[PDB]
Design a protein around this ligand. Sequence first.
Ligand SMILES: COc1ccc(-c2cnn3c(N)c(-c4ccccc4)c(NC4CCN(C)CC4)nc23)cc1OC
Ligand SMILES: [Cl-]
Ligand SMILES: [Cl-]
Length: 283
Amino acid sequence: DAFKILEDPKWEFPRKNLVLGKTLGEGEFGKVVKATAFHLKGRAGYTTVAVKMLKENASPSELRDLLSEFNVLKQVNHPHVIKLYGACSQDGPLLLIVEYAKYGSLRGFLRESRRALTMGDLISFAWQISQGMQYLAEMKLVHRDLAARNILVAEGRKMKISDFGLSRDVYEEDSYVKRSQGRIPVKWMAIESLFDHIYTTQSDVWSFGVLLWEIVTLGGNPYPGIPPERLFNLLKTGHRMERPDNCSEEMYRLMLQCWKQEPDKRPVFADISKDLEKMMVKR
Ligand SMILES: COc1ccc(-c2cnn3c(N)c(-c4ccccc4)c(NC4CCN(C)CC4)nc23)cc1OC
Ligand SMILES: [Cl-]
Ligand SMILES: [Cl-]
């Protein structure tokens, strides 16, 4: 029975210690509300947090993605990865108590700033995300849904990689796994994911390339008006997005390297973090 949730004493939090507040956002993803949690992870007072829960019209696959995000979050801990604090899994709706990111998504944050942001700010955002990705790749995780919509902006404009429900291990550990087919946005999928359903740390690098383009265009829309079929044929014949305005030559070069046809010819996240750090310190 996939509806039965086994309690994890390490993450269980009392429902009566949690004050549910205003809705931050609701969509296909579920429902996220702002909350105050009392006596969280041993501390004496209260903590402002975000709580994710199923929507009223949630389906079994939405519960499966919420449980999957919960189990991935239990394993990771990094300053540029959204932090799990606990959960209320018994005697009521499943609630995930997570780090609160006051600015919402990076896509909305960038779009709203069209708020003064410099190129330095943009490089620093990309660099923070690359450090998180680099740590996630050493944790043997393949994110699959890296995109500006799926990254949060917390206090002090700090990037927090989020949305771990579609995350996979680089080496599949289960004897039997039922894959939820075609869940990643077409425009953020690497060429090998589009043709062969292949998702590795190198396809996360291709998605990081699309994310770079989103950051540099302040939440722009990649490949405007190109249908999935034409997009796939264009990528197959070597066509890539042109250099957008307000993007340095060195930054566009890094994007092209992320979109190389051959996965092993793309840079690794450790190289990307050093590339972005040099770009930051040059100024
Ligand atoms: C202006 O609007 C917003 C303002 C603040 C937030 C906000 C603050 N903190 N926080 C979290 N901790 C999680 C989150 C992350 C992982 C697990 C559980 C919860 C979360 N989850 C979404 C991430 C984006 N994707 C796309 C869907 C889930 N959203 C927010 C969100 C907003 O808009 C939806
Ligand atoms: Cl701030
Ligand atoms: Cl997996």
